[PDB]
Nucleic acid binder design. Sequence first.
RNA 1: UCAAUGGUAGGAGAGCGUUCUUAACCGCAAUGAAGGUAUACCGUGAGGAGUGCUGGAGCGUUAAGAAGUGAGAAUGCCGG
RNA 2: GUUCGGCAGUCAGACUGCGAGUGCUAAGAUCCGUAGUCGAAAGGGAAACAGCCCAGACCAACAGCUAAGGUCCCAAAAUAU
RNA 3: UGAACCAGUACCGUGAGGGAAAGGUGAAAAGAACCCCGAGAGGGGAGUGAAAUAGCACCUGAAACCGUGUGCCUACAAGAAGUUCGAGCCCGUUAAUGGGUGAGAGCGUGCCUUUUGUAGAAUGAACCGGCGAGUUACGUUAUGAUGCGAGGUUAAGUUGA
Lengths: 53, 112, 101, 147, 117
Amino acid sequence: AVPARHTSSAKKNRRRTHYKLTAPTVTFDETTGDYRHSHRVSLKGYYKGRKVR
Amino acid sequence: EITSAKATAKTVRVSPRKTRLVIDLIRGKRVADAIAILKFTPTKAAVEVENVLNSAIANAENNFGLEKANLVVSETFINEGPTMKRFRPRAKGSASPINKRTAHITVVVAEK
Amino acid sequence: YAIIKTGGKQVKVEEGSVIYVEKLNVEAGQTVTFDEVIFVGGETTKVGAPLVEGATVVGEVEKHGKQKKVVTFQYKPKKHSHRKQGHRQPYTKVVIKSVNA
Amino acid sequence: MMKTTFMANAQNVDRKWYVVDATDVPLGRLSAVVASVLRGKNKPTYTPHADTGDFVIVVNAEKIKLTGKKATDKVYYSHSLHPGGLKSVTAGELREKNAVRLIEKSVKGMLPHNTLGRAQGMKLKVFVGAEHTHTAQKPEVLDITGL
Amino acid sequence: ARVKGSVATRKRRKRILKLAKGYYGAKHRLFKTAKEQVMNSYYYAFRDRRQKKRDFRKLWIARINAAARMNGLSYSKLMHGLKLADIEVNRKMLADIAIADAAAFTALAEEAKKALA
RNA sequence: UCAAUGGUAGGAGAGCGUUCUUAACCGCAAUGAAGGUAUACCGUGAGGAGUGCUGGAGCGUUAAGAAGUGAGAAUGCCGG
RNA sequence: GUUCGGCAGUCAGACUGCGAGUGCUAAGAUCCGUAGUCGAAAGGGAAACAGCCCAGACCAACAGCUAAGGUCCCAAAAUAU
RNA sequence: UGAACCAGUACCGUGAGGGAAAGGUGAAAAGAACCCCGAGAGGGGAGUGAAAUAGCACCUGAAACCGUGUGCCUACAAGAAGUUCGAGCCCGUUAAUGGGUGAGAGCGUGCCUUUUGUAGAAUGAACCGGCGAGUUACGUUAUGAUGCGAGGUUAAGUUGA
């Protein structure tokens, strides 16, 4: 429960190694933008090439 | 003549450790990738980095107009500032404070 | 090429080799010779050399100075171990050309 | 004065190969001198980080001149980390099966137990009844005696 | 007279830390583990001011019995032939002939052969 | 030259550094005082200055006097 | 060495033998006298070891010789006679 | 001075009581017009001023903490985290027998009080910085220093800055 000794900060970051965030795949400039994700909706209503608000 | 495309921010409560979860995606890629992930980020910390990011592109056209589509991020860093504490109550006189996480938010972009 | 023990340090000298040696009563640079040279040494020549005569190190004396002040605190018991010495050494850089071999 | 030492090896190492065998030779008296060559301790070029790790080759390793009843009371042991981890390879046993660690575990007892000791000690060349293999390089037979 | 000498005190602190610099990780990011860390290091650097003596001599005698053993000669009877031998009882330059000296090495070995003889 | 130099509580001797000293002695200072910082010098030690940089007002000498005067360590304290 | 003068602290130690006592002539047990050792004395030897043995460190040193103890490899010297 | 600051303040406690923290921009606010980003703040240009790392808790700015870049090394390793030597690499300095490394390899039980003996599973120490502890009043004794010497000696007081 209660820790014994001090974490050395290098080992603390060695705990913090796998903790990182993962980039989501973003569809890039479509006309000149704007963006969606694949399997997701654009800001212009577009999923599967048709506007749905 | 200089790239010098830097902006910053101060006094926002955003957990700079989790912004150091943010910036690893940032530091290498072009600004189209940056506002791509930045618009599509499911963290609260990375929307308002378009204040610094947009303000730094707005530096580059504030007095440069240089390489505006071409601008890839040179560097960032987001640091803690003075985290403002608050004497949080907790049971039977425990009451520990809270470090509200201040941050400078610094971005340079450039070419190449 | 020879071997000479000037101090308590027996030394391969090459006929041209710059060496180091502790302080001698040379003063600035008077290139003087030393005579207890025992070997032909690094030979590729005449062999043997139990006790050598005339092959003395005609020493090309250069310089003597201070070495490096290494330091001393000592011995560690518990309950207040105590304290420092620490010095350097008046070393002596001297090039050795001109053995008689 | 200061650098009268010399490694002369610590980058420029040598590599030589030695078929070393006798069919029956005693284990200790073979073992410490093949330890000496796998050091390269006999080579006149020692450095504590020399890496004069010899290609110490053994073939035809069937027999130790076995003093006493050592094939009945030599018995080895081991301990797997599962509790009650006694597992014993025993005295005459696995000599006739695989006399490999019958040698090189004892040469692990010979060697300086470190990364270099496990380097050449884990670069032994071991054959038990063979004419070994890969004489593409040049092997050389070393001595008979315990010197 | 409530005076401090504060910068002088931190100059002792600064003096020992700048003289303490180099070792692992947290140590120069702290104060006091570094204090022994130079200190233990020249405790047994004081011992190795005697023990690289007593180990470079092991390199000396070891490599010279390596080449002597390459001539099939053992160090004890070699040195025994060196006390039997000439004005030379020269030791460790005679260790230094490990480079390329069949003349100096094996011939001085023959001097020892005519010293046992 | 000879002899000595393990050393705790112990006892003796000596010296360093800080600050104030009207003292003088006698300077520095905006071309940069102090202070900070890096520094690959010196000094048996404590310690001392050199340079680069911050920095923009007091500081250093010497010698002597006087001291709230030499900092890890105590549930030391306070602040982070 | 004495004398005189200041200034101390030490009161409770162990251990190794050696000779005693008590104890199951049990004990790394106690309690004496006796020497050493540590404490308050490194280095080496015995696998590490405060007490055993050797040997008392101002320092440098890329010098040699040696104490006990060692010389098949780790780990240096004798596959010594 | 508890209190250089709207201090006996805040605040605690019903009360008697207790009892904090905190000064410094720049000479002069001359306090950043404007322009742009930004919901706004905040930033960024411009300009301000000797200076803007000088921008309103603002001189100076360590220290722990978090960083970002950086040359070397490490993903067959089981160390009081060290020396000493050193392959190899990188760089060139209070110009110096240069430094930064460091694979590898030898040998290496942290520091304090107490104890007979602690490496300790005996304490204690989160760290960092600041503070933080043998005095003087009067008296005696000892030791010296000085002065005069069987003669040394003025106390209190008065005078006077």
